[PDB]
Amino acid sequence: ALSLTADQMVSALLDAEPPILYSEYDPTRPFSEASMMGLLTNLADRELVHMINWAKRVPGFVDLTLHDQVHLLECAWLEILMIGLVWRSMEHPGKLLFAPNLLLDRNQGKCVEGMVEIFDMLLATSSRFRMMNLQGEEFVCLKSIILLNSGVYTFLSSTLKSLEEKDHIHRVLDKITDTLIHLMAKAGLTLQQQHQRLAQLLLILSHIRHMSNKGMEHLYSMKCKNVVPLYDLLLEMLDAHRLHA
């Protein structure tokens, strides 16, 4: 990512994409019986496992310390789930594609107290992506920027090691910036359109932060799982051995 080309960054990111998972509920059973929060909590936990795998394939991420990888993911995991949801809902106006077998509109969100507000925010992001004609290549750049950016300002201490980590991360961010501009240019945008679209894409990231903050607030109006700190589950998934190499 520091000597990788833009072309290389884009293909690495494309190659790293996690799979689209299915909701787990018996499709021969009614629907009034399923807990939607149970269905969504199960889905999200299964995605998180694959998120960890993806993150290790983002250029520059595994050159970070184990601790810093945990921090970044702990800060960004819900933004990352959310932009992935909005991305796969793009071609489904008025609907959120949680999974190919689980397509919800906003009235289905009303089923959960305070959840329709979140649904409306996600739907509105999906519509903006649609209106901008966001491309697959731009999406994977955006998802990787979220990974690297969301927690970079809140590393507590400032050891030599930590200062070096922050420099690296800003360097990778800079290369992902180069990559986004390179894509727009190949796509034929003018220099002017290039910076304008860069800004439009990056400002959306502040709306996705908003949604994650609001969702955490809403998630923390308990009904899901907070057992075992999130740091430690993440740390266990990231701190792998090399025995199955």
Ligand X SMILES: C[C@@H]1c2cc(O)ccc2O[C@@H](c2ccc(OCCN3CCCC3)cc2)[C@H]1c1ccc(O)cc1
* Residue 160 touches which of ligand X, its own copies, none (Cβ within 5-8 Å per kind): none
- Decide: is 171 part of the binding site for ligand X (CB under 6 A): no
- Decide: is 128 part of the binding site for its own copies (CB under 8 A): yes
- The candidate with the shortest Cα–Cα distance to 148, out of 181, 172, 164, 175, is 172
DSSP per residue, the chain? --SS-HHHHHHHHHHTPPPPPPP-S-TTS-STTS-HHHHHHHHHHHHHHHHHHHHTTSTTGGGS-HHHHHHHHHHHHHHHHHHHHHHHHTTSTT-EEEETTEEE-HHHHTTSTTTHHHHHHHHHHHHHHHHHT--HHHHHHHHHHHHHHTTTT------HHHHHHHHHHHHHHHHHHHHHHHHHHHTT--HHHHHHHHHHHHHHHHHHHHHHHHHHHHHTSSSS---S-HHHHHHHHHS--STT-
Site map (CB under 6 A) of ligand X, residues 217-236, x = contact: -xx----xx----x------
The residue within the footprint of ligand X, chosen from 11, 41, 162, 194 (CB under 6 A), is 41
Stretch that binds its own copies, among 35-43, 91-99, 124-132, 228-236 (CB under 8 A): 124-132
Do the Cβ atoms of 231 and 66 come closer than 8 Å? no
- Decide: is 215 part of the binding site for ligand X (CB under 6 A): yes
Nearer to its own copies, 50 or 166 (CB): 166
* Residue 196 touches which of its own copies, ligand X, none (Cβ within 5-8 Å per kind): its own copies
Stretch that binds ligand X, among 27-35, 57-65, 181-189, 213-221 (CB under 6 A): 213-221
Q: Within 104-123, which residues bind its own copies (CB under 8 A)?
A: 120-121
Stretch that binds ligand X, among 27-35, 38-46, 56-64, 147-155 (CB under 6 A): 38-46
- Decide: is 81 part of the binding site for its own copies (CB under 8 A): no
- Decide: is 195 part of the binding site for its own copies (CB under 8 A): yes
- Please give the residue ranges that form the binding site for its own copies (CB under 8 A): 120-121, 124-125, 128, 145, 149-150, 153-154, 156, 170, 173-174, 177-178, 181, 191-192, 194-196, 198-200, 202-210, 213-214, 217
